[PDB]
């Protein structure tokens, strides 16, 4: 996308979202990141939405194929699961590469840095979902370390109702439950996050209240499933 203007890439990312063309969306936003400028709040959301949808479809397909493969145990199901897996890993590596070159290092404000570190934890988590053995351990630790740094910044720099702080805590709790085999840590984190947000709702306008309570309901939904 090197020959397209940054503003045109952003505009086309928005059109691609409206058209539900998420692969195109992600390609436009990769091009925008590669222009080398920092991303605004809205532009960070476009980057995240694009890749979440792309990798979300890959993850759903991988789970379908992995389930069929487990039931079977010719080479076709394994071969095709491996093909989808390699594609998924490539998307995760692409996102991680954008974060490392150079989104995180240029992000000084807490909101941007936390947003990118949450992404980093998420894409290492998606790598961990398909990893095996003694590559899986290092991938898990990379996810944990990214989430932990984001958590440390968010607790110092953002109110407990901030939607990025809340979503980070939600996703880190999912990491603890599903990846790290730490369901008690997952439940603790979700409970403390929910309670501290509850106690800060009084400070919020109606619109901020709506966003924060929506994520708090997702924390509660997990707590209900886990307890």
């Amino acid at each position: 996308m090197g020959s397209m203007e940054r503003a045109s890439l952003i505009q086309k990312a928005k059109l691609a979202e409206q058209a539900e063309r998420y692969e195109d969306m992600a390609a436009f936003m990769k091009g925008a990141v590669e222009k080398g400028e920092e991303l605004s709040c809205e532009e960070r959301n476009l980057l995240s939405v694009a890749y979440k949808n792309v990798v979300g479809g890959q993850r759903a397909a991988w789970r379908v194929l992995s389930s069929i493969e487990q039931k079977s145990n010719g080479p076709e199901v394994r071969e095709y699961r491996e093909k989808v897996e390699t594609e998924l890993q490539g998307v995760c590596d692409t996102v991680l590469g954008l974060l490392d070159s150079h989104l995180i290092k240029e992000a000084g404000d807490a909101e941007s840095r936390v947003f990118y570190l949450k992404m980093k934890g998420d894409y290492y988590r998606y790598l961990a979902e398909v990893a095996t053995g003694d590559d899986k351990k290092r991938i898990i630790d990379s996810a944990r370390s990214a989430y932990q740094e984001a958590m440390d910044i968010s607790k110092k720099e953002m109110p407990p109702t901030n939607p990025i702080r809340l979503g980070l805590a939600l996703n880190f709790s999912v990491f603890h439950y599903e990846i790290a085999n730490s369901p008690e840590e997952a439940i603790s984190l979700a409970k403390t996050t929910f309670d501290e947000a509850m106690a800060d709702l009084h400070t919020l306008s109606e619109d901020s209240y709506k966003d924060s309570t929506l994520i708090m309901q997702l924390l509660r939904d997990n707590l209900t499933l886990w307890t």
């Binding site: 928005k14 979202e17 939405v49 998420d122 979503g167 939600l170 439950y177 939904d221 997990n222």
Partner: peptide
């Protein structure tokens, strides 16, 4: 369980 859906701007 459920992570941030984050599939719509």
């Amino acid at each position: 369980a459920g992570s941030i859906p984050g599939r719509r701007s």
